[model samples]
Target: ARIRHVQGDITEFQGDAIVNAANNYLKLGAGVAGAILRKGGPSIQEECDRIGKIRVGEAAVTGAGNLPVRYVIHAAVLGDEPASLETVRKATKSALEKAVELGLKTVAFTSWGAWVGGLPAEAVHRVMGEEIKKAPDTLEVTGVHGTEKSAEAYRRAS
Candidate 1:
Protein backbone atom coordinates (compact mmCIF):
# COMPACT_ATOMS: atom_id res chain seq x y z
CA ALA A 1 0.00 0.00 0.00
CA ARG A 2 1.00 3.61 -0.54
CA ILE A 3 2.04 5.87 2.32
CA ARG A 4 -0.48 8.54 3.29
CA HIS A 5 -0.32 11.61 5.53
CA VAL A 6 -2.70 13.17 8.06
CA GLN A 7 -1.93 16.36 9.93
CA GLY A 8 -4.02 16.20 13.10
CA ASP A 9 -4.32 14.83 16.61
CA ILE A 10 -3.19 11.26 17.07
CA THR A 11 -5.86 10.69 19.68
CA GLU A 12 -8.67 11.66 17.32
CA PHE A 13 -7.42 9.76 14.26
CA GLN A 14 -9.05 6.45 13.39
CA GLY A 15 -6.40 4.05 12.22
CA ASP A 16 -5.71 0.35 12.36
CA ALA A 17 -3.51 1.03 15.37
CA ILE A 18 -2.14 3.94 17.39
CA VAL A 19 1.16 3.86 19.21
CA ASN A 20 1.21 5.07 22.81
CA ALA A 21 4.14 6.72 24.51
CA ALA A 22 3.66 4.64 27.60
CA ASN A 23 5.50 4.52 30.87
CA ASN A 24 6.94 1.34 32.34
CA TYR A 25 3.91 1.06 34.59
CA LEU A 26 1.59 1.27 31.57
CA LYS A 27 -0.56 3.80 33.40
CA LEU A 28 -2.36 6.33 31.19
CA GLY A 29 -1.25 9.76 32.26
CA ALA A 30 -1.18 13.20 30.62
CA GLY A 31 -0.39 13.94 27.00
CA VAL A 32 -1.02 11.36 24.30
CA ALA A 33 -2.20 8.62 26.63
CA GLY A 34 -4.51 11.02 28.43
CA ALA A 35 -6.08 12.28 25.21
CA ILE A 36 -6.62 8.78 24.00
CA LEU A 37 -8.31 7.88 27.27
CA ARG A 38 -10.59 10.87 26.93
CA LYS A 39 -11.62 10.09 23.36
CA GLY A 40 -11.14 6.37 22.93
CA GLY A 41 -13.20 5.79 26.10
CA PRO A 42 -12.56 4.22 29.51
CA SER A 43 -12.64 0.67 28.28
CA ILE A 44 -9.15 1.23 26.95
CA GLN A 45 -8.08 2.26 30.41
CA GLU A 46 -9.73 -0.76 31.98
CA GLU A 47 -7.82 -2.99 29.63
CA CYS A 48 -4.59 -1.13 30.17
CA ASP A 49 -5.06 -1.09 33.90
CA ARG A 50 -5.06 -4.84 33.80
CA ILE A 51 -1.68 -5.00 32.12
CA GLY A 52 -0.23 -3.63 35.36
CA LYS A 53 3.41 -2.66 34.94
CA ILE A 54 5.59 -3.12 31.91
CA ARG A 55 9.35 -2.91 31.74
CA VAL A 56 11.17 -0.24 29.83
CA GLY A 57 11.88 -1.01 26.19
CA GLU A 58 8.88 -3.35 26.20
CA ALA A 59 5.44 -3.12 24.59
CA ALA A 60 1.86 -4.16 25.26
CA VAL A 61 -1.24 -4.28 23.06
CA THR A 62 -4.86 -3.52 23.81
CA GLY A 63 -8.14 -3.28 21.93
CA ALA A 64 -8.79 0.09 20.33
CA GLY A 65 -12.37 0.03 21.66
CA ASN A 66 -14.55 2.75 20.06
CA LEU A 67 -11.70 4.24 18.05
CA PRO A 68 -11.23 3.48 14.36
CA VAL A 69 -8.32 1.16 15.10
CA ARG A 70 -8.48 -2.43 16.17
CA TYR A 71 -5.60 -2.17 18.59
CA VAL A 72 -3.46 0.20 20.63
CA ILE A 73 0.26 -0.46 20.78
CA HIS A 74 1.62 0.69 24.16
CA ALA A 75 5.36 0.93 23.79
CA ALA A 76 7.29 1.58 26.99
CA VAL A 77 9.21 4.54 25.70
CA LEU A 78 9.89 5.55 29.31
CA GLY A 79 11.10 3.39 32.11
CA ASP A 80 10.10 3.11 35.74
CA GLU A 81 13.06 5.32 36.49
CA PRO A 82 13.74 7.69 33.57
CA ALA A 83 14.16 7.54 29.80
CA SER A 84 16.59 8.56 27.10
CA LEU A 85 16.40 8.95 23.31
CA GLU A 86 17.84 5.50 22.71
CA THR A 87 15.10 3.88 24.81
CA VAL A 88 12.36 5.84 23.06
CA ARG A 89 13.77 5.03 19.62
CA LYS A 90 14.00 1.37 20.43
CA ALA A 91 10.43 1.37 21.71
CA THR A 92 9.19 3.18 18.60
CA LYS A 93 10.86 0.73 16.25
CA SER A 94 9.67 -2.21 18.30
CA ALA A 95 6.11 -0.91 18.36
CA LEU A 96 6.19 -0.45 14.60
CA GLU A 97 7.54 -3.94 14.16
CA LYS A 98 4.81 -5.31 16.40
CA ALA A 99 2.16 -3.54 14.35
CA VAL A 100 3.64 -5.03 11.20
CA GLU A 101 3.70 -8.43 12.82
CA LEU A 102 -0.02 -8.09 13.50
CA GLY A 103 -0.59 -7.10 9.85
CA LEU A 104 -1.68 -3.58 10.79
CA LYS A 105 -1.43 -1.25 7.79
CA THR A 106 -1.78 2.19 9.33
CA VAL A 107 -0.38 3.32 12.66
CA ALA A 108 0.09 6.63 14.43
CA PHE A 109 2.70 7.57 17.02
CA THR A 110 2.16 9.86 20.02
CA SER A 111 5.31 10.86 21.83
CA TRP A 112 3.57 12.50 24.82
CA GLY A 113 6.84 14.03 25.92
CA ALA A 114 8.20 10.63 26.86
CA TRP A 115 11.66 11.36 25.61
CA VAL A 116 13.62 14.37 26.72
CA GLY A 117 10.66 15.85 28.41
CA GLY A 118 10.62 19.66 28.77
CA LEU A 119 13.04 20.00 25.89
CA PRO A 120 12.36 22.57 23.22
CA ALA A 121 9.80 21.41 20.67
CA GLU A 122 12.34 21.66 17.87
CA ALA A 123 14.75 19.31 19.65
CA VAL A 124 12.03 16.76 20.30
CA HIS A 125 10.96 16.88 16.70
CA ARG A 126 14.49 16.60 15.45
CA VAL A 127 15.15 13.52 17.51
CA MET A 128 11.80 11.86 16.82
CA GLY A 129 12.00 12.67 13.13
CA GLU A 130 15.42 11.08 12.88
CA GLU A 131 14.19 7.95 14.63
CA ILE A 132 10.93 7.68 12.66
CA LYS A 133 12.73 7.96 9.34
CA LYS A 134 14.30 4.66 10.21
CA ALA A 135 10.90 2.96 10.59
CA PRO A 136 10.06 0.02 8.35
CA ASP A 137 7.97 0.30 5.20
CA THR A 138 5.20 -2.03 6.38
CA LEU A 139 3.62 0.67 8.51
CA GLU A 140 2.50 4.11 7.30
CA VAL A 141 3.38 6.90 9.77
CA THR A 142 1.25 9.99 10.27
CA GLY A 143 2.07 13.13 12.25
CA VAL A 144 -0.14 14.15 15.15
CA HIS A 145 -1.98 17.47 15.47
CA GLY A 146 0.29 19.24 17.96
CA THR A 147 3.35 17.66 16.36
CA GLU A 148 3.19 19.51 13.04
CA LYS A 149 5.95 21.92 13.93
CA SER A 150 8.12 19.08 15.13
CA ALA A 151 7.38 17.11 12.00
CA GLU A 152 8.25 20.07 9.85
CA ALA A 153 11.53 20.50 11.67
CA TYR A 154 12.16 16.82 11.16
CA ARG A 155 11.48 17.16 7.45
CA ARG A 156 13.84 20.11 7.22
CA ALA A 157 16.52 18.19 9.09
CA SER A 158 16.14 15.30 6.63
Candidate 2:
Protein backbone atom coordinates (compact mmCIF):
# COMPACT_ATOMS: atom_id res chain seq x y z
CA ALA A 1 0.00 0.00 0.00
CA ARG A 2 1.02 3.61 -0.57
CA ILE A 3 2.35 5.47 2.46
CA ARG A 4 0.43 8.35 4.06
CA HIS A 5 1.83 11.27 6.07
CA VAL A 6 0.00 13.40 8.63
CA GLN A 7 0.76 16.06 11.25
CA GLY A 8 -0.56 15.37 14.76
CA ASP A 9 -0.05 13.43 17.99
CA ILE A 10 0.49 9.73 17.32
CA THR A 11 -1.37 8.61 20.43
CA GLU A 12 -4.63 10.01 19.09
CA PHE A 13 -4.41 8.38 15.71
CA GLN A 14 -6.55 5.42 14.64
CA GLY A 15 -4.74 2.45 13.16
CA ASP A 16 -4.04 -1.22 13.70
CA ALA A 17 -0.80 -0.30 15.51
CA ILE A 18 1.53 2.63 16.24
CA VAL A 19 5.31 2.56 16.31
CA ASN A 20 7.07 3.93 19.40
CA ALA A 21 10.64 5.22 19.27
CA ALA A 22 11.90 3.10 22.09
CA ASN A 23 15.19 2.86 23.91
CA ASN A 24 16.94 -0.49 24.41
CA TYR A 25 15.22 -0.76 27.78
CA LEU A 26 11.84 0.14 26.29
CA LYS A 27 11.29 2.95 28.76
CA LEU A 28 8.40 5.31 27.98
CA GLY A 29 9.86 8.48 29.42
CA ALA A 30 9.59 11.50 27.09
CA GLY A 31 8.49 12.52 23.63
CA VAL A 32 6.53 9.77 21.86
CA ALA A 33 7.02 7.29 24.65
CA GLY A 34 5.77 9.75 27.26
CA ALA A 35 2.71 10.54 25.17
CA ILE A 36 1.98 6.88 24.76
CA LEU A 37 2.11 6.24 28.50
CA ARG A 38 0.08 9.35 29.25
CA LYS A 39 -2.68 8.36 26.87
CA GLY A 40 -2.10 4.64 26.69
CA GLY A 41 -1.61 4.20 30.47
CA PRO A 42 0.90 2.17 32.56
CA SER A 43 -0.01 -1.25 31.35
CA ILE A 44 2.07 -0.68 28.26
CA GLN A 45 5.18 -0.13 30.34
CA GLU A 46 4.40 -3.14 32.49
CA GLU A 47 4.30 -5.22 29.36
CA CYS A 48 7.58 -3.70 28.26
CA ASP A 49 9.24 -4.68 31.52
CA ARG A 50 8.00 -8.19 31.07
CA ILE A 51 9.83 -8.36 27.76
CA GLY A 52 12.97 -6.77 29.28
CA LYS A 53 15.72 -5.24 27.14
CA ILE A 54 15.90 -5.53 23.36
CA ARG A 55 18.90 -4.74 21.20
CA VAL A 56 19.07 -1.48 19.32
CA GLY A 57 17.98 -2.00 15.71
CA GLU A 58 15.33 -4.46 16.86
CA ALA A 59 11.58 -4.16 17.50
CA ALA A 60 9.12 -5.50 20.06
CA VAL A 61 5.35 -5.52 20.43
CA THR A 62 3.12 -4.87 23.47
CA GLY A 63 -0.50 -4.09 24.17
CA ALA A 64 -1.53 -0.49 23.50
CA GLY A 65 -3.41 -0.15 26.79
CA ASN A 66 -5.86 2.74 26.45
CA LEU A 67 -4.58 4.01 23.12
CA PRO A 68 -6.66 3.58 20.01
CA VAL A 69 -4.79 0.63 18.58
CA ARG A 70 -4.33 -3.06 19.05
CA TYR A 71 -0.55 -3.13 19.51
CA VAL A 72 2.43 -0.86 20.07
CA ILE A 73 5.55 -1.75 18.09
CA HIS A 74 8.49 -0.45 20.11
CA ALA A 75 11.25 0.27 17.61
CA ALA A 76 14.46 0.13 19.64
CA VAL A 77 16.33 2.78 17.74
CA LEU A 78 18.16 4.55 20.56
CA GLY A 79 20.22 3.46 23.56
CA ASP A 80 23.01 4.72 25.89
CA GLU A 81 25.34 4.93 22.92
CA PRO A 82 24.76 7.29 20.01
CA ALA A 83 22.71 5.95 17.14
CA SER A 84 24.04 5.36 13.64
CA LEU A 85 22.30 5.54 10.28
CA GLU A 86 22.47 1.78 9.96
CA THR A 87 20.85 1.44 13.39
CA VAL A 88 17.94 3.62 12.30
CA ARG A 89 17.59 1.64 9.09
CA LYS A 90 17.56 -1.67 10.92
CA ALA A 91 15.07 -0.44 13.54
CA THR A 92 12.72 0.83 10.84
CA LYS A 93 12.88 -2.49 9.06
CA SER A 94 12.36 -4.38 12.31
CA ALA A 95 9.26 -2.34 13.19
CA LEU A 96 7.63 -3.13 9.88
CA GLU A 97 8.51 -6.78 10.27
CA LYS A 98 6.93 -6.85 13.73
CA ALA A 99 3.80 -5.21 12.35
CA VAL A 100 3.41 -7.82 9.65
CA GLU A 101 4.27 -10.55 12.13
CA LEU A 102 1.31 -9.48 14.23
CA GLY A 103 -0.94 -9.63 11.13
CA LEU A 104 -1.52 -5.89 11.36
CA LYS A 105 -2.34 -4.27 8.04
CA THR A 106 -2.26 -0.58 9.02
CA VAL A 107 0.60 0.87 11.06
CA ALA A 108 1.33 4.47 12.05
CA PHE A 109 4.81 5.74 12.81
CA THR A 110 6.35 9.01 13.88
CA SER A 111 9.68 10.22 12.48
CA TRP A 112 11.96 7.63 14.06
CA GLY A 113 15.27 9.01 15.40
CA ALA A 114 14.17 12.53 14.52
CA TRP A 115 12.87 13.13 18.03
CA VAL A 116 14.86 12.11 21.14
CA GLY A 117 17.50 10.29 19.15
CA GLY A 118 18.78 13.66 17.76
CA LEU A 119 19.37 12.37 14.25
CA PRO A 120 19.06 14.74 11.30
CA ALA A 121 15.74 14.89 9.51
CA GLU A 122 17.34 14.01 6.23
CA ALA A 123 18.81 10.76 7.50
CA VAL A 124 15.63 9.82 9.30
CA HIS A 125 13.58 10.57 6.22
CA ARG A 126 15.91 8.65 3.95
CA VAL A 127 16.06 5.54 6.12
CA MET A 128 12.34 5.48 6.97
CA GLY A 129 11.37 6.18 3.38
CA GLU A 130 13.62 3.41 2.19
CA GLU A 131 12.05 0.90 4.57
CA ILE A 132 8.53 2.08 3.83
CA LYS A 133 9.30 1.68 0.15
CA LYS A 134 10.19 -1.97 0.69
CA ALA A 135 7.36 -2.73 3.12
CA PRO A 136 5.06 -5.55 2.13
CA ASP A 137 2.00 -4.75 0.02
CA THR A 138 -0.22 -6.20 2.72
CA LEU A 139 0.67 -3.41 5.18
CA GLU A 140 -0.38 0.25 4.95
CA VAL A 141 2.06 2.84 6.36
CA THR A 142 1.21 6.23 7.82
CA GLY A 143 3.68 8.74 9.24
CA VAL A 144 2.37 10.80 12.17
CA HIS A 145 4.25 13.92 13.15
CA GLY A 146 3.56 16.58 15.80
CA THR A 147 4.77 19.50 13.73
CA GLU A 148 3.78 20.72 10.30
CA LYS A 149 7.43 21.31 9.46
CA SER A 150 8.29 17.67 10.06
CA ALA A 151 5.09 16.51 8.46
CA GLU A 152 5.87 18.40 5.26
CA ALA A 153 9.51 17.35 5.34
CA TYR A 154 8.59 13.68 5.51
CA ARG A 155 6.06 14.16 2.72
CA ARG A 156 8.64 15.70 0.40
CA ALA A 157 11.47 13.36 1.35
CA SER A 158 9.45 10.16 1.20
Candidate 3:
Protein backbone atom coordinates (compact mmCIF):
# COMPACT_ATOMS: atom_id res chain seq x y z
CA ALA A 1 0.00 0.00 0.00
CA ARG A 2 1.09 3.60 -0.55
CA ILE A 3 1.99 5.90 2.31
CA ARG A 4 -0.63 8.38 3.50
CA HIS A 5 -0.04 11.94 4.63
CA VAL A 6 -1.86 13.74 7.43
CA GLN A 7 -1.24 17.24 8.62
CA GLY A 8 -3.13 18.59 11.63
CA ASP A 9 -3.60 17.47 15.18
CA ILE A 10 -2.19 14.04 15.92
CA THR A 11 -4.29 13.61 19.04
CA GLU A 12 -7.50 13.79 17.06
CA PHE A 13 -6.40 11.59 14.17
CA GLN A 14 -8.64 8.67 13.27
CA GLY A 15 -6.69 5.48 12.64
CA ASP A 16 -6.42 1.87 13.62
CA ALA A 17 -3.85 2.66 16.30
CA ILE A 18 -1.89 5.58 17.76
CA VAL A 19 1.44 5.34 19.49
CA ASN A 20 2.00 7.41 22.61
CA ALA A 21 5.33 8.82 23.66
CA ALA A 22 4.86 7.68 27.18
CA ASN A 23 7.05 7.40 30.21
CA ASN A 24 7.56 4.21 32.12
CA TYR A 25 4.66 5.01 34.38
CA LEU A 26 2.46 5.72 31.34
CA LYS A 27 0.89 8.65 33.20
CA LEU A 28 -0.50 11.44 31.10
CA GLY A 29 1.76 14.42 31.52
CA ALA A 30 2.68 17.43 29.44
CA GLY A 31 2.92 16.93 25.66
CA VAL A 32 1.36 14.27 23.44
CA ALA A 33 0.25 12.03 26.27
CA GLY A 34 -1.58 14.95 27.89
CA ALA A 35 -3.44 15.84 24.69
CA ILE A 36 -4.49 12.21 24.20
CA LEU A 37 -5.61 11.95 27.80
CA ARG A 38 -7.61 15.11 27.46
CA LYS A 39 -9.37 14.04 24.28
CA GLY A 40 -9.63 10.29 24.86
CA GLY A 41 -11.24 10.87 28.30
CA PRO A 42 -10.23 9.83 31.79
CA SER A 43 -11.01 6.24 30.99
CA ILE A 44 -7.74 6.21 29.06
CA GLN A 45 -5.95 6.85 32.28
CA GLU A 46 -7.98 4.16 34.01
CA GLU A 47 -6.85 1.68 31.38
CA CYS A 48 -3.27 2.79 31.75
CA ASP A 49 -3.46 2.44 35.49
CA ARG A 50 -4.92 -1.00 35.10
CA ILE A 51 -2.10 -2.00 32.78
CA GLY A 52 0.28 -1.04 35.54
CA LYS A 53 3.76 0.18 34.46
CA ILE A 54 6.01 -0.59 31.50
CA ARG A 55 9.77 -0.40 31.38
CA VAL A 56 11.95 1.70 29.14
CA GLY A 57 12.37 0.44 25.55
CA GLU A 58 9.14 -1.52 25.96
CA ALA A 59 5.47 -0.95 25.13
CA ALA A 60 1.91 -1.92 26.06
CA VAL A 61 -1.25 -2.00 23.97
CA THR A 62 -4.74 -1.18 25.20
CA GLY A 63 -8.17 -0.51 23.81
CA ALA A 64 -8.93 2.97 22.52
CA GLY A 65 -12.30 2.74 24.21
CA ASN A 66 -14.11 6.03 23.56
CA LEU A 67 -11.43 7.29 21.22
CA PRO A 68 -11.82 7.10 17.45
CA VAL A 69 -9.22 4.41 17.04
CA ARG A 70 -9.43 0.76 17.92
CA TYR A 71 -6.20 0.57 19.90
CA VAL A 72 -3.68 2.76 21.68
CA ILE A 73 -0.05 1.74 21.44
CA HIS A 74 1.80 2.93 24.55
CA ALA A 75 5.54 3.02 23.79
CA ALA A 76 7.93 3.85 26.59
CA VAL A 77 10.27 6.31 24.94
CA LEU A 78 11.45 7.64 28.22
CA GLY A 79 12.64 6.26 31.47
CA ASP A 80 13.39 8.55 34.45
CA GLU A 81 15.00 11.14 32.16
CA PRO A 82 11.95 11.24 29.93
CA ALA A 83 14.06 12.86 27.19
CA SER A 84 16.58 10.43 25.91
CA LEU A 85 16.85 10.12 22.12
CA GLU A 86 18.31 6.63 22.32
CA THR A 87 15.45 5.52 24.46
CA VAL A 88 12.98 7.18 22.12
CA ARG A 89 14.45 5.38 19.13
CA LYS A 90 14.35 2.10 20.97
CA ALA A 91 10.71 2.61 21.85
CA THR A 92 9.79 3.62 18.32
CA LYS A 93 11.48 0.60 16.81
CA SER A 94 9.88 -1.71 19.34
CA ALA A 95 6.44 -0.23 18.82
CA LEU A 96 6.67 -0.76 15.07
CA GLU A 97 7.83 -4.32 15.52
CA LYS A 98 4.98 -5.04 17.85
CA ALA A 99 2.46 -3.54 15.46
CA VAL A 100 3.80 -5.71 12.66
CA GLU A 101 3.81 -8.78 14.85
CA LEU A 102 0.14 -8.19 15.62
CA GLY A 103 -0.66 -7.78 11.88
CA LEU A 104 -1.65 -4.17 12.28
CA LYS A 105 -1.95 -2.30 9.02
CA THR A 106 -1.54 1.24 10.39
CA VAL A 107 -0.18 2.89 13.49
CA ALA A 108 0.63 6.43 14.66
CA PHE A 109 3.40 7.73 16.91
CA THR A 110 3.81 10.98 18.85
CA SER A 111 6.69 12.51 20.73
CA TRP A 112 6.84 15.05 23.53
CA GLY A 113 9.82 16.96 22.17
CA ALA A 114 13.44 16.45 21.34
CA TRP A 115 15.00 14.01 23.68
CA VAL A 116 16.86 15.53 26.59
CA GLY A 117 19.77 17.70 25.37
CA GLY A 118 17.66 18.74 22.42
CA LEU A 119 18.61 16.19 19.79
CA PRO A 120 17.81 17.32 16.27
CA ALA A 121 14.84 15.91 14.37
CA GLU A 122 17.12 14.81 11.54
CA ALA A 123 19.03 12.61 13.94
CA VAL A 124 15.97 11.07 15.46
CA HIS A 125 14.40 10.47 12.08
CA ARG A 126 17.54 8.85 10.78
CA VAL A 127 17.72 6.50 13.72
CA MET A 128 14.02 5.74 13.78
CA GLY A 129 13.83 5.17 10.04
CA GLU A 130 16.72 2.77 10.14
CA GLU A 131 15.00 0.66 12.77
CA ILE A 132 11.64 0.69 11.03
CA LYS A 133 13.08 -0.24 7.66
CA LYS A 134 14.28 -3.50 9.16
CA ALA A 135 10.76 -4.69 9.89
CA PRO A 136 9.09 -7.31 7.71
CA ASP A 137 6.70 -6.49 4.90
CA THR A 138 3.77 -7.57 7.02
CA LEU A 139 3.70 -4.07 8.52
CA GLU A 140 3.40 -0.75 6.78
CA VAL A 141 5.09 2.25 8.38
CA THR A 142 3.09 5.42 8.38
CA GLY A 143 3.75 8.91 9.70
CA VAL A 144 4.94 9.87 13.16
CA HIS A 145 3.83 12.86 15.25
CA GLY A 146 5.24 14.77 18.15
CA THR A 147 3.87 16.89 20.98
CA GLU A 148 5.69 19.95 19.67
CA LYS A 149 5.74 21.85 16.40
CA SER A 150 9.27 20.81 15.57
CA ALA A 151 8.44 17.15 15.78
CA GLU A 152 5.34 17.62 13.70
CA ALA A 153 7.26 19.53 11.07
CA TYR A 154 9.94 16.90 11.04
CA ARG A 155 7.38 14.21 10.35
CA ARG A 156 5.91 16.24 7.55
CA ALA A 157 9.23 17.00 5.93
CA SER A 158 10.51 13.45 6.17
In order of appearance, the predictions have TM-scores of: 0.80, 0.91, 0.80
Instruction: Encode model 1's per-residue lDDT on 15-115: one tens digit a residue.
Output: 78888878878788876677788888899889888988877877789998777789999988775657776666667667777787898778886545655
Say which candidate scores most in TM-score: 2
Cα RMSD to the true fold for all candidates: 3.0, 1.7, 3.3
lDDT of 3 by residue, 1-158 (tens): 22334455666767678877777787878766677788888888898899888888888887776677777888887767555668877888778766876778766654435344477766776676677667676665556543356555664765
**In candidate 1, which residue pairs get closer than 3 Å at backbone N, Cα or C atoms, i.e. clash?**
8-145
Better of 2 and 3 by TM-score: 2
What lDDT would each prediction earn against the true structure? 0.72, 0.84, 0.70
Q: Which runs of model 1 end up more than 4 angstroms from their true locations?
A: 1-6, 118-131, 147-151
Candidate 3 segments exceeding 4 Å error: 1-5, 111-117, 144-158
Q: Give the Å shift of residue 27 in candidate 2.
A: 1.4
Candidate 3 achieves a global lDDT of 0.70
lDDT measured at residue 7 in model 3 versus the true structure, 0 to 100? 51
TM-score of candidate 3 versus the correct structure, residues matched by position: 0.80
Residue 44 CA displacement from its true place in model 1, Å: 1.1
The clash count of every prediction, one per candidate, is 1, 0, 1
Ranking by lDDT: 2, 1, 3
lDDT at 57, model 1? 74
lDDT of 1 at 87: 66
